[PDB]
Amino acid sequence: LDLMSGILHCEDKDYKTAFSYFFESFESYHNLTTHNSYEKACQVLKYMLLSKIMLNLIDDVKNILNAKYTKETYQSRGIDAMKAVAEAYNNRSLLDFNTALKQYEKELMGDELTRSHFNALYDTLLESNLCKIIEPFECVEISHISKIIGLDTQQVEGKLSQM
Amino acid sequence: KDYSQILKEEFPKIDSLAQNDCNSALDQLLVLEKKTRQASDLASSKEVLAKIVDLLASRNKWDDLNEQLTLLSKKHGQLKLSIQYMIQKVMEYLKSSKSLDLNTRISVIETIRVVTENKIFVEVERARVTKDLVEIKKEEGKIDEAADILCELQVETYGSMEMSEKIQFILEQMELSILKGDYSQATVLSRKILKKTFKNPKYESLKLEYYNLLVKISLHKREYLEVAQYLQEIYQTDAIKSDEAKWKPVLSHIVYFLVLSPYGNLQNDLIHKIQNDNNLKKLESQESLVKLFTTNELMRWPIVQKTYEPVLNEDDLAFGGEANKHHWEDLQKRVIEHNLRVISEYYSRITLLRLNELLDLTESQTETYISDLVNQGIIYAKVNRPAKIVNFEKPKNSSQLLNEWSHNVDELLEHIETIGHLITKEEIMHGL
């Protein structure tokens, strides 16, 4: 019941409320152990980290994966896939984001529910990628920005006037 | 009384195997129990109850001896505190026998329920028993089994007992945690024993572990802010137990750590240091480089960086050395930061053609380190690509420009007031 509660909050965002149901659910699936399938507990761990990424919090994401008592018997490439995404989201670059995007697409993106979130992060991190390019303030070349991000000129200029 | 006649009680059982020794211990168990119970602290002789250990030692396996301690643990044992003096007897024949009993010694520790289960903690014995089992695991090549045993022992801390020896027990897991491959486990242990021993004076053997474990954890972290902190604390304060010949070169690595760290508040403290200027020339050579932070032109630095590396690629008393690339990996990144801080505090604007010649880098490598310092909130510089210049002047509002002008007006009144009082002070020489 608490699992499907936070899922309905994905459309209207406001992930601070959905995180309350995701945190309380992890204690329920962890106490079941052999009484249920281990795959169900792995999906709950994904909903907690992906909800904190939308809230733009780096420390709260690293407090779980780096903690050995949070994962324990639950580990896989799909769980560690969010670690590379969190590092790419913190650095705000499409180089490390797209590197693990197509590699884990058969694992991390295998869930159609969470797939809609990565599509929003495409335009979200791209606007965040421009923040790392504008670090030397103003007086930068538009053509020089397109060569760094590696996209079309019309595609970059469309996202520059958006922000 | 009856305790002095124990030698003459059984004549024949001394020269034989004496299979009835198990029955003789049970007969004395019920008799001496009613005469002591929990009333008298020390009444019955501990040697009488521990005599069964000396009866069968090298003439029988230790499996039957552990069964006798199990029955005494479940029963009263003639006293409630008698178990305290029984395990003290167990620690004698262990180191005096060895031979083929080293392999069976592991089963002896695991069989005893006092060292395993938690008790009233009158022992101050089992702490060394647990360490003996871990030393066997380290000799067998198991890094994980050695660190996991002492991890649960440090959870229960005795009230007082050993003071300086207990510190070594707490610091023992920190040494085996890094060997396990995780340095984050020893971080929690450094936040407990260090605070309690901060105000207490440490002896010679106490500070030997802090000289290593404190800088060893941050060694793999590659963070030099914590390396030059805990090291200088033990170095500057006391540290008179060591030899002054090897004590001076320790400072040579301390100054080298300030360059790899993002500056610090300890740089000016070592400039006025007495022992830093004199004695070893490497101490003054690295100290002379500290005054060059503001005057850095980057011109002569790679000449020395490629020629003289006394503390750079050669480490002895601190890091012990790793590789030539590892020590120079973060070295080149800091030297660039030393130059950019000077230009930001000197040049208001400079062309990219000249800035690349001063940094000895390309166009891509130049804007890489400059843009990284902007996000860290250190240097704010506006790079002008069309003009091919970088403006280091930060913008100021109208209130900030008028505020600094107000400090000058108040400063001019100080010079007017100072000179006003100097006329009367210098009137002695003028009116002479």
Instruction: Please check whether residue B407 lies inside any domain of the structure.
Output: no
Q: Do both B45 and B190 map to the same domain?
A: yes
* From A66, A132, A137, residue closest to B383, measured CB to CB: A137
Which residue, of B346, B364, B385, is where some domain finishes? Answer: B346
What is the rounded distance in angstroms from the CA atom of residue B144 to the CA atom of residue B127?
Answer: 19
Q: Do both B365 and B342 map to the same domain?
A: no
Are B171 and B213 a contacting pair, CB within 8 Å?
yes
Q: Do both B191 and B155 map to the same domain?
A: yes
What token pair was written down for A99?
A: 């590197």
Q: Do both B311 and B376 map to the same domain?
A: no
Experimental technique behind these coordinates: cryo-EM
Q: Which of A40, A48, A43 is nearest to A18 (CA)?
A: A48
3-state secondary structure of A155: helix
Q: Do both B351 and B373 map to the same domain?
A: yes
Q: Which among A63, A68, A135 is the top mutation candidate for probing chain B, defined by the most B β-carbons within 10 Å of its own β-carbon?
A: A135
- Residue B374 touches partner A, C-beta closer than 8 Å: yes
Q: Do both B291 and B359 map to the same domain?
A: no
| B15 Cα distance to chain centroid | 55
Instruction: Please check whether residue B406 lies inside any domain of the structure.
Output: no
Query: What amino acid occupies position B336?
Result: I
Q: Do both B103 and B183 map to the same domain?
A: yes
Instruction: Please check whether residue B331 lies inside any domain of the structure.
Output: yes
Distance from CA of A138 to the nearest CA of B (A): 7
Instruction: Please check whether residue B409 lies inside any domain of the structure.
Output: no
* From B374, B384, B386, residue closest to A135, measured CB to CB: B374
Q: Do both B99 and B187 map to the same domain?
A: yes
User: What residues contact B83, with CB distance under 8 A and at least 6 apart?
Assistant: B72, B73, B77, B114, B119, B122
Query: What's this structure's resolution in Å?
Result: 3.8
Residues shown for chain B: 432
Q: Do both B68 and B213 map to the same domain?
A: yes
Q: Do A139 and B374 touch (CB under 8 A)?
A: no
What is the rounded distance in angstroms from the CA atom of residue B66 to the CA atom of residue B73?
Answer: 11
Residue found by looking up tokens 């091919």 in the block: B388
Are B73 and B113 a contacting pair, CB within 8 Å?
yes
Which residue, of B346, B380, B409, is where some domain finishes? Answer: B346
What is the rounded distance in angstroms from the CA atom of residue B198 to the CA atom of residue B200?
Answer: 6
First-residue to last-residue Cα distance in chain B: 107
Which residue, of B283, B317, B346, is where some domain finishes? Answer: B346
Q: Do both B318 and B200 map to the same domain?
A: yes
Nearest 5°: the CA angle B160, B165, B167 is 85
Q: Which of B157, B166, B242 is nearest to B197 (CA)?
A: B166
Q: Which of B171, B147, B159 is nearest to B122 (CA)?
A: B159
Instruction: Please check whether residue B117 lies inside any domain of the structure.
Output: yes
**Nearest C-alpha in B relative to A66:** B184
Q: What is the largest CA-CA distance in chain B?
A: 119
**Residue A75: left if φ>0, alpha if ψ -120 to 50, beta else—which one?**
beta
Q: What are phi and psi of B383, to 5 degrees?
A: -90, 120
> Looking at beta carbons, which residues of chain A come within 8 Å of B392?
none
Distance from CA of B187 to the nearest CA of A (A): 13
Q: Do B382 and A144 touch (CB under 8 A)?
A: no
> Looking at beta carbons, which residues of chain B come within 8 Å of A139?
382-387
What is the rounded distance in angstroms from the CA atom of residue A65 to the CA atom of residue B410?
Answer: 57
Using a CB–CB cut-off of 8 Å, the residues of A that contact B are 66, 132, 135-141, 144
Instruction: Please check whether residue B389 lies inside any domain of the structure.
Output: yes
> Looking at beta carbons, which residues of chain B come within 8 Å of A138?
382
Instruction: Please check whether residue B5 lies inside any domain of the structure.
Output: no
> Looking at beta carbons, which residues of chain B come within 8 Å of A62?
none
- Residue B272 touches partner A, C-beta closer than 8 Å: no
Q: Do both B359 and B218 map to the same domain?
A: no
Query: Could you list the residue range(s) of the whole structural domain that residue B384 is in?
Result: 347-395
Run of H or E residues at B207 = helix B204-221
What token pair was written down for B8?
A: 């003459």
User: How many domains in chain B?
Assistant: 2
What is the rounded distance in angstroms from the CA atom of residue B223 to the CA atom of residue B221?
Answer: 5
What is the rounded distance in angstroms from the CA atom of residue A144 to the CA atom of residue B222?
Answer: 34
First-residue to last-residue Cα distance in chain A: 39
Q: Do both B336 and B357 map to the same domain?
A: no
Q: Do B387 and A132 touch (CB under 8 A)?
A: no
Query: What amino acid occupies position B359?
Result: L
